[PDB]
Design a protein around this ligand. Sequence first.
Ligand code: HEM
Ligand code: NA
Ligand code: NA
Length: 269
Amino acid sequence: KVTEAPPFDVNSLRRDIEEILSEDMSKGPLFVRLAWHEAGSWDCRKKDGSPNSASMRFHPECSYAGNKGLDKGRNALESLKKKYPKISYADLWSFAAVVSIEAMGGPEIPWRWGRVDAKDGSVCGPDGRLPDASRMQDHVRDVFSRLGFNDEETVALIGAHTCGECHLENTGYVGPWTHDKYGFDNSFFTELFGNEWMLNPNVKKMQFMDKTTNRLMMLPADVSILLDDKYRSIAKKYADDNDYFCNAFSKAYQKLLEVGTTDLKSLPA
Ligand code: HEM
Ligand code: NA
Ligand code: NA
C-alpha cells in the first residue's frame, strides 16, 4: 500500500537500540513485554483499549498490576525520544521491541511506522485486559480471543517467554523460563515439554520450577498450554521446528503491534 521515509533516521535509531542492548541485554525482553503490554489493552469486538498509542504513559493504565516494572522500559527509551523527537512513543516502543527480537536472534519482523500518541489518559481502556498468570487455558483463550488471535497465534505469542525472566519486585514471580533468556528461539517449548514441573515452595505466588535444576520456572498460565489439548499440539510443532515457530511469532507479533492502527507506512529499502 503506502511506502514513505519516516521523519527520523530509522537506521541510526536501529543502531542505537542495539547499542542500548549491548550495554544491558536485560532491556531486550523488557522492550518486548512493553510493546505487547501497549498492544494488549485492545478489544476487537468493543474497538477500545487505545492499543499502540503509548497510552501506558498515562494513568490509570501505567498503574495496572500487569504493567508494573514497565517504567524501567519507558525510562530506558526517554533519550532516543529526545534524540529522535519526530518519533511517537508508540513507534519507538514497537520499533524497540522488533529490533530487540532481531538482536536476540529471532526473526526480522516486518515493521511499519505511523502510530500516534494518546495526549492524555481519557482513551485508556480498563484493567483486567492483560492476562492473569495465576489463571489457566480458559482465561488465556478468553483474553487472546478478545485481542483477536487464533490458537496458533496465542501459543506462538506466549512463545516469547523464551526470553527474559520474572521479577519478585514486579509480579512476585521469579526467574527465567530458559537457560538462555537473552536468546529468542523455540527453547521455551523445548524446556516446557522436556522437564517435570513442580511447586516452588519458596515463592508466595504459585509458580513451577524444573525438577532437573530448579533454575527454570513456569507460570500457571504457561503450564496450561500442556493441560490444554489444543495448545499442547501446537506447542509440540513449535518445540519441534523453530522455523514454523519463528515464522508464526513474526506474523502474530506484527499483528499485535498494529491492532487498533490505521494509516501505517512501510519503510523504503
Ligand atoms: C497469558 C499470557 C501471558 C501471561 C500470563 C504473561 C505473564 C508474564 C509475567 C508475569 C512476566 C514477568 C513480569 C516481570 O516480573 O518482569 C512476563 C514476562 C514476559 N512476558 Fe509475558 N505473559 C503472557 C504472554 C506474553 C506475550 C504474548 C509476550 C510477548 C508477545 C510475553 C512476553 C514476555 C516477556 C518478553 C517477558 C519478560 C520481561 C523481562 O524480562 O523484563 N508474554 N510475562
Ligand atoms: Na494501550
Ligand atoms: Na534463548
